Subunit: 163 residues, 3 copies
C-alpha cells in the first residue's frame, strides 16, 4: 500500500478536513473512477421543484492551478430526478470553507428524501488554465487565422428537427 | 490522413464499440471542437418536466487517468429547453457499459421529440487527477498559508442585487 | 506586474474582444479562482421556469487543444435558483462568435431580474483531449483487461435508499 507505484508517482494529494468526523472520507467507488463521492451531513426532504444548500461535512484545499468540480450522481438523477443547481459546482483553489451541494428536485411529483450519510454528489479535481486575458480589437488584428467554425454556435451544425 | 502530424503526436486514442451499428461514429462538428456528438439510439417524447434515460448505441474505454464528460448541446438547450439531469455526466475509466444520456425537458409547455439518429449530447475526454486524500485536523496544521478567498463562497464576491 | 513569475511561465493567454466595451473585462474574484466572471450585456427578467439566451459582450479565442467552459455561479444558484440550461456550456477552440449564456429560472415562484453589468456566470479554460476514435468489435478484441467497475453505472454502487 504505502509504496507509490511508478505510474502513480505524480498523483496529486488533496488536504481534507472532516468538519463532520461522523462521515466516512469521500472515496472512489471503483479504481479509476473520476470522482470521490461526497456525503450529506444532513437529513433533507425536497418537494418537487425545491432546492437546498446541503452540508457535506468536508473542507478541502484544491491545489493552486487546479479546480474541484462537484457533479451529480447518475443513479439519483435518473431514478428520482435529483440534480445540482450550479452543476458543475466550481471549488476554487483558495476556498477553505465547507463544500456545500445545491441539491434540487427536478421530478414533477415525488419528493426526494436525503439522509445523513447518503452519497449525494461526486468531487473531481482537475488542472485549470489560469488564463491571462489579452484584449484585442479583433481576432484578425491578433494575427489569428480564420476558423472553420467561425461564429457558428447554438445548433449551427444541425442534428435535430428544431435546429 | 494516416500520418499523425507532429502537433498531434500525443493525441489520445479512445476505443469505441458501436453497440448499435446503424448510427454513425460520434464526430466533432468542426476541427478543434471539444467534444464528439452522441446520437440517440431511440425515439423518445418528453413532456414538460419529464426525463428519460436514453441509449446512445456506444460504449467507450476512457483511459485510466482520464474521464469522459457528457455535456448538453447549446442549440437544443436554448431552442427547446433540452437539458441533462446529471450534467456533466461523468464516465469513469473503468466503465464498459453503454453510455446513456439522462435527457430532461425544462420547457414549461412544449414537448420535445427526439428521433433515433438525432445528436443529443456531446462527449469530451479530459485528464483527471486521481487524488490521494490527506486527512488533516486543520489547514493551519498542514502548513497551508491563509488564502485571500478564505471561507468565502456562495455569492461572497457580489455582482447581483440578491447577493 | 509585467514580469511573469517562474511558477506562471507556462500560463496560457486568451485573446478576448469586448464586443460591448461598456462592460469590464472578465476577472477572477480572488487569486487562484478557477474561472473569470462573465457579465450580462442585457437586462432580462425570467419568470419561474423561463429561460433566455443572454449576451455577455465578449468573444474569445480558446486555444486549439483547449475548451472554454461556462459554469453557473453558486450564490445565484442557491439564493434565487438561477441556472444554465446547457451547463457546463462548451466553448469550442474554433468559435469566434459572442459567448452567450442560456440562463434559466429554476425557482417555482419568484422571478429573477438580471441587470446589465451583473456577473451571471464564470468561464474556465481547460485542456481537452482531441480524441481519435478507434472502433473495435469488443473491448476484449482490443486487448483491454476486464475492469472492476465493468458495466456498472447509474447508481450501481448504492448510497441512497432509491438505488
Ligand atoms: O454556453 C455556450 C455554449 C456554446 N456557445 C457557442 C460556442 C460553441 O463553440 C458553440 C457550439 O456549442 P455546442 O456544440 O455546445 N452547441 P451545438 O452543438 O448545439 O451547436 P453547433 O451545432 O454549432 O456545434 O456555441 C456559447 O456561446 N455558449
Ligand atoms: O458547489 C459548490 C460551488 C462552490 N462552492 C464554494 C467554493 C467556491 O470556491 C465558492 C465560490 O463558488 P462560485 O464562484 O462558483 N460562486 P459565486 O461566484 O456565487 O461565489 P463568490 O462570489 O464567492 O465567488 O463557493 C461550494 O461550496 N459548492
Ligand atoms: O451521463 C452518464 C453518467 C454516467 N454513466 C455511467 C458511466 C459511469 O462510469 C457510471 C457511474 O456514473 P456516476 O458515478 O456519475 N453515477 P452513480 O454514482 O449513481 O453510479 P455508480 O454507483 O455506478 O458509481 O454510469 C452514463 O452512462 N452516463
Ligand atoms: Mg458513482
Ligand atoms: Mg456542437
Ligand atoms: Mg465566484
Amino acid at each position: 500500500s504505502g509504496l507509490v507505484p511508478r505510474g502513480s508517482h505524480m498523483s496529486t494529494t488533496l488536504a481534507i478536513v472532516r468538519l463532520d468526523p461522523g462521515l466516512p472520507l469521500p472515496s472512489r467507488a471503483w479504481d479509476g473512477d473520476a470522482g470521490v463521492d461526497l456525503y450529506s451531513a444532513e437529513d433533507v426532504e425536497l418537494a418537487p421543484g425545491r432546492r437546498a444548500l446541503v452540508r457535506t461535512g468536508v473542507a478541502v484545499a484544491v491545489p493552486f492551478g487546479m479546480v474541484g468540480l462537484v457533479h451529480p450522481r447518475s443513479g439519483l438523477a435518473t431514478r428520482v430526478g435529483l440534480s445540482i443547481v450550479n452543476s458543475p459546482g466550481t471549488i476554487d483553489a483558495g476556498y477553505r470553507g465547507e463544500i456545500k451541494v445545491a441539491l434540487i428536485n427536478l421530478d414533477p411529483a415525488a419528493p426526494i428524501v436525503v439522509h445523513r450519510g447518503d452519497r449525494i454528489a461526486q468531487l473531481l479535481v482537475q488542472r485549470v488554465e489560469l488564463v491571462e486575458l489579452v484584449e484585442v480589437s479583433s481576432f484578425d488584428e491578433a494575427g489569428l487565422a480564420s476558423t472553420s467554425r467561425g461564429d457558428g454556435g447554438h445548433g449551427s451544425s444541425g442534428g435535430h428537427a428544431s435546429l
